[PDB]
Amino acid sequence: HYSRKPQVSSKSAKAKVSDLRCHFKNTFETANVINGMPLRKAQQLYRQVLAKTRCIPFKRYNGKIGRTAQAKEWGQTKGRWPRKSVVAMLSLLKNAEANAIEKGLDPNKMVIKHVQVDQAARMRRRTYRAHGRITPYMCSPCHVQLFMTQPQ
RNA sequence: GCGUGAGCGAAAGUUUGAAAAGCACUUUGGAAAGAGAGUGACAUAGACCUGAAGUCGUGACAAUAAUGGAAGUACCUCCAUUUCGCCAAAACCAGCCUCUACUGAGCAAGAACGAGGUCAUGGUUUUGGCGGAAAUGGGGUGCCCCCACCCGUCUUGAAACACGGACCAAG
RNA sequence: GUCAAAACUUAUGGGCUCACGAACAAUGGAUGACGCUCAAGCCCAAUUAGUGCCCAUUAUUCCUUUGGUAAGGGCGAGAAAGUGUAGCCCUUCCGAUGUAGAUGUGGCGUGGAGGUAAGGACGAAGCUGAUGGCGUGAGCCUCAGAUGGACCAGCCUCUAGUGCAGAUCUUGGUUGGCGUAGCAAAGAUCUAACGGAACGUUGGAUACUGGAGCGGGGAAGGAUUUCGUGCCAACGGCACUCGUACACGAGUUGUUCGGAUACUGAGCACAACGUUACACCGUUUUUAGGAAAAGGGGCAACAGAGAACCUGGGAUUAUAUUCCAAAAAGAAAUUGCAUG
RNA sequence: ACUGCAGACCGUACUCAUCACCGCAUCAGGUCCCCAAGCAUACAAUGCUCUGGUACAUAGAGAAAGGUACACUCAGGGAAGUCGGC
RNA sequence: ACUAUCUAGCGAAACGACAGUCAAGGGAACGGACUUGAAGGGCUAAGCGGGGAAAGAAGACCCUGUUGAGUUUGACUCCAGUCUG
RNA sequence: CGGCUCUUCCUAACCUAGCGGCUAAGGGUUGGAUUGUUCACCCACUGACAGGGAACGUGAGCUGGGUUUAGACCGUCGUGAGACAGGUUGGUUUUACCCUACUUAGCUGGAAAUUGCGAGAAAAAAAAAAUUUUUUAAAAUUUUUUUUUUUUUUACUUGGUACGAAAAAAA
RNA sequence: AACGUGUCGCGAUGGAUGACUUGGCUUCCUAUUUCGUUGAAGAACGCAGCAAAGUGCGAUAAGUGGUAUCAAUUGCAGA
RNA sequence: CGAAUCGCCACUUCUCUCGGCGCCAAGUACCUUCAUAUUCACAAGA
RNA sequence: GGUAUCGUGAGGGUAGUACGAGGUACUCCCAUGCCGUGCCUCUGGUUUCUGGAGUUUGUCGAACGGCAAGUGCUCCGACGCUAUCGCACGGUGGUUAGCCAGUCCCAAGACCAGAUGCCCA
RNA sequence: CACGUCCCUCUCCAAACGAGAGAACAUGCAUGGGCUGGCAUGAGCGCGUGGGGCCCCGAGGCGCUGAACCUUGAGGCCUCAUGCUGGGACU
Numbered sequence A: 001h002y003s004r005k006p007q008v009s010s011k012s013a014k015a016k017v018s019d020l021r022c023h024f025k026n027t028f029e030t031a032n033v034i035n036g037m038p039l040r041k042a043q044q045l046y047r048q049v050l051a052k053t054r055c056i057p058f059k060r061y062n063g064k065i066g067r068t069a070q071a072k073e074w075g076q077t078k079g080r081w082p083r084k085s086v087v088a089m090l091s092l093l094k095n096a097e098a099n100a101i102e103k104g105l106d107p108n109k110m111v112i113k114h115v116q117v118d119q120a121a122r123m124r125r126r127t128y129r130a131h132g133r134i135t136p137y138m139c140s141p142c143h144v145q146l147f148m149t150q151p152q
Numbered sequence B: 001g002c003g004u005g006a007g008c009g010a011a012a013g014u015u016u017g018a019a020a021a022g023c024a025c026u027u028u029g030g031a032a033a034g035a036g037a038g039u040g041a042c043a044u045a046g047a048c049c050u051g052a053a054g055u056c057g058u059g060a061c062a063a064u065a066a067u068g069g070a071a072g073u074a075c076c077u078c079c080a081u082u083u084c085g086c087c088a089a090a091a092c093c094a095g096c097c098u099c100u101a102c103u104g105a106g107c108a109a110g111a112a113c114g115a116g117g118u119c120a121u122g123g124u125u126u127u128g129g130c131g132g133a134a135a136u137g138g139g140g141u142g143c144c145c146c147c148a149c150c151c152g153u154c155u156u157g158a159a160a161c162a163c164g165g166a167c168c169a170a171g
Numbered sequence C: 001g002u003c004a005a006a007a008c009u010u011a012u013g014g015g016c017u018c019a020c021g022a023a024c025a026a027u028g029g030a031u032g033a034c035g036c037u038c039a040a041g042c043c044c045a046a047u048u049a050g051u052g053c054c055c056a057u058u059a060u061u062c063c064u065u066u067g068g069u070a071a072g073g074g075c076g077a078g079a080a081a082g083u084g085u086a087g088c089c090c091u092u093c094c095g096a097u098g099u100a101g102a103u104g105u106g107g108c109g110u111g112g113a114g115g116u117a118a119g120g121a122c123g124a125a126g127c128u129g130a131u132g133g134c135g136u137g138a139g140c141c142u143c144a145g146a147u148g149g150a151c152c153a154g155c156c157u158c159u160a161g162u163g164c165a166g167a168u169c170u171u172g173g174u175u176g177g178c179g180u181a182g183c184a185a186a187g188a189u190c191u192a193a194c195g196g197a198a199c200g201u202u203g204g205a206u207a208c209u210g211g212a213g214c215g216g217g218g219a220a221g222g223a224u225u226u227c228g229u230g231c232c233a234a235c236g237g238c239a240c241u242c243g244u245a246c247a248c249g250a251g252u253u254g255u256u257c258g259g260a261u262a263c264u265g266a267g268c269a270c271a272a273c274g275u276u277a278c279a280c281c282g283u284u285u286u287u288a289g290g291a292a293a294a295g296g297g298g299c300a301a302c303a304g305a306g307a308a309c310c311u312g313g314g315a316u317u318a319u320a321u322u323c324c325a326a327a328a329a330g331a332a333a334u335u336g337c338a339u340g
Numbered sequence D: 001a002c003u004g005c006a007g008a009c010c011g012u013a014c015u016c017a018u019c020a021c022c023g024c025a026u027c028a029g030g031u032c033c034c035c036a037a038g039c040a041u042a043c044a045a046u047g048c049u050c051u052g053g054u055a056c057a058u059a060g061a062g063a064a065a066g067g068u069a070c071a072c073u074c075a076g077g078g079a080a081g082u083c084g085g086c
Numbered sequence E: 001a002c003u004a005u006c007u008a009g010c011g012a013a014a015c016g017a018c019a020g021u022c023a024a025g026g027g028a029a030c031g032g033a034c035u036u037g038a039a040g041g042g043c044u045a046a047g048c049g050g051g052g053a054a055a056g057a058a059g060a061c062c063c064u065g066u067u068g069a070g071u072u073u074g075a076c077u078c079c080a081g082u083c084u085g
Numbered sequence F: 001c002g003g004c005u006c007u008u009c010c011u012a013a014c015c016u017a018g019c020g021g022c023u024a025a026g027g028g029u030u031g032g033a034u035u036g037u038u039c040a041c042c043c044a045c046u047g048a049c050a051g052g053g054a055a056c057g058u059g060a061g062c063u064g065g066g067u068u069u070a071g072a073c074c075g076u077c078g079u080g081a082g083a084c085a086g087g088u089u090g091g092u093u094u095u096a097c098c099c100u101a102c103u104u105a106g107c108u109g110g111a112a113a114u115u116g117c118g119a120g121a122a123a124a125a126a127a128a129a130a131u132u133u134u135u136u137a138a139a140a141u142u143u144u145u146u147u148u149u150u151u152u153u154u155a156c157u158u159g160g161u162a163c164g165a166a167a168a169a170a171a
Numbered sequence G: 001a002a003c004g005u006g007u008c009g010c011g012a013u014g015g016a017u018g019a020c021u022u023g024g025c026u027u028c029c030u031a032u033u034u035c036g037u038u039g040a041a042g043a044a045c046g047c048a049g050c051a052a053a054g055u056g057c058g059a060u061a062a063g064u065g066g067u068a069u070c071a072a073u074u075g076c077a078g079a
Numbered sequence H: 001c002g003a004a005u006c007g008c009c010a011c012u013u014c015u016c017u018c019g020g021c022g023c024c025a026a027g028u029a030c031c032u033u034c035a036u037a038u039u040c041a042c043a044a045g046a
Numbered sequence I: 001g002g003u004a005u006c007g008u009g010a011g012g013g014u015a016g017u018a019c020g021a022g023g024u025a026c027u028c029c030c031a032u033g034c035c036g037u038g039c040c041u042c043u044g045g046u047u048u049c050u051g052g053a054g055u056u057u058g059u060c061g062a063a064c065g066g067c068a069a070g071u072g073c074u075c076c077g078a079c080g081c082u083a084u085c086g087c088a089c090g091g092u093g094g095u096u097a098g099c100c101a102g103u104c105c106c107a108a109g110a111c112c113a114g115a116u117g118c119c120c121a
Numbered sequence J: 001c002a003c004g005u006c007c008c009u010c011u012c013c014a015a016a017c018g019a020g021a022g023a024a025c026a027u028g029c030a031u032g033g034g035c036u037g038g039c040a041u042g043a044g045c046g047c048g049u050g051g052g053g054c055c056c057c058g059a060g061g062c063g064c065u066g067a068a069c070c071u072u073g074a075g076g077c078c079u080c081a082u083g084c085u086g087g088g089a090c091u
C-alpha cells in the first residue's frame, strides 16, 4: 500500500486510484503541486488550474514544454494545464474528503501529507508508421495515492 | 496467427490458499474504483507462490563530464571487536643511521671523541589520557590535495576522426 | 622563480648577450604557461666558497607475501616424517612485470550422482542488505530482513548441457530521446432544448456533396459487419452519452429473381489406349465389338445462350418482384398430372 | 376450353468502400457493373443548385522566424537569373 | 490559408558507449576525454544547421578469396539435337 | 567538380593611403556572352577588377550542369558476351525532434563562488561651515516651546503641486 | 533555491530467481500387437438442460446395449 | 555558536633615495596570588 | 532581507567607405555610390478594412439585400508593413595607415560596500 | 504578516511562448457623435433606343445625392456624449 504511513491513523484520510487512465507525466506534475497543501487550497488550485487561471508547474517532466507566465508562482518558467489530470486529482481529493469525513475528521482542516503518483502497468496500442512499420502507442496510466492528516 | 499456396507456426505454469473461507456489509464515487469492515496463520497470499535486476515514484539525508585510484578528513554508521584494555608521552638496552698519514699550505688521506636521530626496528616496562559509553576496525556520504584518456577489438600502432558498445534479467 | 618537490630567486663564480634566448601564410596561441633581462637566457664552473637540494615501481635496508623441482635445523597452546590445505614447526637465501601460449593449484564456484556428516516450520532454498568478518583472488561466512514458505549447506569421490558486459549475440522486460516529433490532404460548423455522472438527439441556422455524388443498387471480396435493446472495460491514434466496438436478443420467406435441374465456349479431363523403372504423362476418343429400349462419359459462363410475375400494401426494428388470405390487395403467366 | 391438385433444391441480411474488399490499419493507394436532375455552357469540361446525402475526418487561442500551397500581388527593368526560361 | 508557435487530448520513431567550450600541441599523423593555456553558475524556450569525421547500410567503387552467379566463346570437359554409316 | 549562399583569415599589394621601390591586410576589388566548369578567352564598367587559406571553406544548406549504375546511340576495340579515363542522350539527392556552436528568449541561484560562524570596502576614520570655532531641549522623565506640515478658506504648461494662514502634532 | 546527482526507507513497474512439475527427452521391454470397398485414414457438419473451445459421440449423437462396480455427478440444475 | 586563527599602535601606518612597544609588578624594587590542572597532549586561556 | 528605481562600466563587440565635381596644388566645399543605423511625411509596392464600387455565372419567387465561385473577377482603397523604389543620420582623441581609447552596441559570473525609494512580522 | 511583487483581468510603443511596456475607478471599456480619410453618388420613390394600346413596358439617364456606406479593428483622431463598471498566489 501507501509508501508512507500517516503519522496518526485516526487523524488522517487516505485515498487512491490505481490504474488511473491519465498520463503519468501530467498526473505526476499535477499531484506533486498538492503534496504539502491544505486540502481546500488544493481543491482550489485545481479549480483555478482547471480554468486556466493558474498553471500546474511542470517540473521534472518538462521536456520542450511551453513557457507560461502562470508558472512564476512556482518558481519556474514552464507550466501547463492538464485537465484530464486535474479532474482526476479533484476526483481523488473528493474521495479523501469523503474518507476524511467518515473518520469524524474535518475536511477543511485537513492537509495533504503524501502524494505519490507511481507509474502503472501500461496499455499497448499500435502505430502504423511510414514504410510498413508498426511502432507502439502506449498510454501511461498512473497510480496516484495520497493521505491527508489534519493537525492536532 | 501467418501465407494465393506448397507450407510456416507461436506465446501461455491460473504454481491465491489447507480450504474460496474468493473481501458480505457500511461509506464516497456515474463508474471504475477508494476508505472501513470481513475471511485466512499470512491479502504488501486479491484471481493472485517467490517477487531479482533494471526503471520509476515517494520520504528522509548528505550534499554539489561522471566514473575511477591514493590518501586523509568531516559527518553518519540497524556493523565488528575490545575495554571498564585504547590513545598517548618519556625513558633503557640493542640495532641503525646521520654528524693520523702523506705531501709541498695541499692530498689520491685515516681514524677518534662527542653529540643527534630513530620502532614503519628489537627487546625493556614506566607514566598519563579515555573507559551507559569509550576505543580500534569496517561500512556509508562529502570534501580536500593528488593520480587518472571509454572499454572490447583486429592491428606495427587505439583515446582515436577505426570497428562493436542504451539498461537489466535468462540463455 | 610560480605553476611544482627542490637554490624561501644559492654562489662570498667567470664571461657573453638587448631582441631575441632556453637532446632525440592563411580559426587566436604558445621556451609547456606565466613571466624572466646584474635572467628565471647562453657557455663555463661550482655547492655554502680563496676557509647543496628535489623527485622513481630504480639501488640499499626493513616488514609481509608468493615461488624456488632453494639451504639448513627440528618433530597458555602446538609439536603432523610433511609437494599441495588454515601450509608440521622454525631459520636463512634468491626470484617476482608480462600479450600470444604452456602449466600448476587439499584453487574458487555451478547442476547432478555414490558416500559421510549435518541442518530445517524455534523457518530450507531463493531473494534484499552503510551485516560485518575471512580470503591476494575467484569467493566463502556470519548478521539483519518489520523477506520467504520447505527444503538443504559441509566434506571426500563421481559427473557435466558447469561460470559471460560485449558476438550489428538470442529472448523477455525496461529505458533516454519525450509529453517530444507530431495527430496540418478534402473547405464548417453555430444555436437552443433535452439527454447524460459529464458526446449524442431534436428543432433552427449554416454550409458541403453536386447525378463519373461522403447518392441508390450489384459482382468480387467480406460473412453477421445487418437490426433492436444495452453498453462503452478494452477498441473507434482527440472525445464520446455515440460506433462497423462490446453484450444480449432478433433478422434473410420465391412455381416465376439468380443459380442448378437443362446450352455451348476458350478450355479441361475420366475412360480406353498408349508411354513411362513408375502415371502424379499424353492424345482426348479408343488397332476400336463404347446403342441396353457411325463417331464413349463428363465438366467448363451467377456478364455469353437460356429464363412462366406484376403491381399495390397501413408489410418489418431488421426481408421482400420472396411477405399479404378468402373480397387472398390483387391480377397473371407457367410446368406436371388429372378432370369434365 | 375448363377445372382439380401439385409446383421440389440452394442464394436471398449487410457491405461494396478516403471505416465493411486488398494493401500487417477504420491506410489520401487500389477495386468490374448499373441509374444519374436543374442552370450557365459546345459540354458528363467548370462553376453552382433541388432530390438523395453529409456536417466524418481531433479541437482551441492567437497570427514569431522558416516552411507547405491544388494562394496571390509587385514600382522600373525584362532572362541580366540559371547548366538550361527551370 | 495551412503548418510551425502556445494550449486541451493523444502520442511514436530514429538514435542512444560515455559524454559533449575552445586554442595550441602532440598523437593511428584534423581530440569531447591526453599536455599546456583560455573560457565556463545552473536550468530553460524558440530557431539553427557549423561541429559532433551526426544517423542511415558488415562501401554497390577497388583489391583479396585456390568464393559465387549471369553472359560469351573457335577455354577445358562434356551432353542432348542433327546428320552420316 | 562546380556554382550559389554566407562568414572568416592570410599577403610574395590589384586599387586605395603614406612615402621614396618601401612600407601598408585597413576597406574594396564589377556586370555580362560561350562553356558544368575551375580555368581561359572575350564585351562593358571600374580607382581597380590581386593572388590565396578555411577538409582543393561551405550537399542532414541548396542546385545537380560536370562526374554520373542500370536504358540507349555512335566511333574504335573485341569471334563474342562485352570494353573505351572517347562522344551522345535519359537517369530517386533521405533524417536533427539529440549534443555542442550559434542566434535570439526567459528563469534562478551565487562572495569559503551554494559550506564557516574563514571577519579584507578603490568607506569613513559632534558636526558643519568658513583645521578651528560655533551652534545645536531644559529643568527638576516630563513638560513646554518651536517648527513644520497639512488643511481649509504669485510662478511655475494652465486641474495640481509650491510656497501664503492658522492650527495641531511631534520632536 | 531549482533542476539534476547520490545514499537510505518504503512503494510501483517488471518478471528473474528459488521451490514446485499429471510434461518432455532418452533407454529398455512386452504381446494372442498392424487399416481399408463389411467404406479406411483424413476432412466436414453435427450431438449436452444450460457447452465456445477441447474431449466423447453420430439423428440411438458428452451416448444405446452387455459386464463389473458401486452411491454418485457435482459450476447450477437435475435422478 | 563548540569552533581553526595567536602581536599591537595615530613613536610604523609620508614621500624619495633596529619604527616604538610588547614577552608577567604600569617596573627593576620581586612587594607578590598561583599547587591537586596531579610529567606532552587545541592555550583548559585571548 | 525583500521589492523598486536610477546609475557604474571592468569585459566584449565596434565601421564607415569610395568616387566625382567645385574652389585654389593642401585646405575648403558640393553631390553621388557602396556600407551601416534607423524611419514611413512623401512616393512606390502590399489589402483579409473582402472598405467602397462595378461586374460574371449559380442562388435566395422578385426588387432590395445578399449569398456560392475555397478571397469569383475588375477598379479605387485607408491602417499597417515596407523600398536605396521614399527619407533621415553615420562624431573624436592618443600613440606607432595600423594600433589603442572614445563616441556606438551588450554590458556585475566584473557578483557594483555605487546611489536611492519603501517595508524590514 | 508588512511593504510589495506576481497571477487573473484590461491596454499595447512589446510579443513565437516567457519577457516587455502600461492600467489598476482610469474617457478604462463600450457603443454613439464629431473629425480625418476611403469610395463614389445608396434605397427609394419622381430625359430616353424603341415598343404596346394619353398613358403604360424600356437599358441607360436625371433629381433629391460628394450621396450611401465604411472609418480602429493587430489596436486613426476628439472628452465630444452617454453606458458599464477587484479575486487569487507569494514573502
Ligand SMILES: [Mg+2]
Pocket (backbone or CB within 6 Å): A064
Ligand atoms: Mg516545440
Ligand SMILES: [Mg+2]
Pocket (backbone or CB within 6 Å): A064, A065, A066, A067, E045
Ligand atoms: Mg515548447
Ligand SMILES: [Mg+2]
Pocket (backbone or CB within 6 Å): A132, D023
Ligand atoms: Mg502497408
Ligand SMILES: [Mg+2]
Pocket (backbone or CB within 6 Å): none
Ligand atoms: Mg506475488
Ligand SMILES: [Mg+2]
Pocket (backbone or CB within 6 Å): B155
Ligand atoms: Mg592498419
Ligand SMILES: [Mg+2]
Pocket (backbone or CB within 6 Å): C004
Ligand atoms: Mg616549490
Ligand SMILES: [Mg+2]
Pocket (backbone or CB within 6 Å): none
Ligand atoms: Mg608473472
Ligand SMILES: [Mg+2]
Pocket (backbone or CB within 6 Å): C111, C161
Ligand atoms: Mg544439467
Ligand SMILES: [Mg+2]
Pocket (backbone or CB within 6 Å): none
Ligand atoms: Mg548499496
Ligand SMILES: [Mg+2]
Pocket (backbone or CB within 6 Å): C161
Ligand atoms: Mg553451456
Ligand SMILES: [Mg+2]
Pocket (backbone or CB within 6 Å): C182
Ligand atoms: Mg507537439
Ligand SMILES: [Mg+2]
Pocket (backbone or CB within 6 Å): C208, C210
Ligand atoms: Mg456545392
Ligand SMILES: [Mg+2]
Pocket (backbone or CB within 6 Å): none
Ligand atoms: Mg448497427
Ligand SMILES: [Mg+2]
Pocket (backbone or CB within 6 Å): none
Ligand atoms: Mg461483436
Ligand SMILES: [Mg+2]
Pocket (backbone or CB within 6 Å): none
Ligand atoms: Mg470445346
Ligand SMILES: [Mg+2]
Pocket (backbone or CB within 6 Å): none
Ligand atoms: Mg454447364
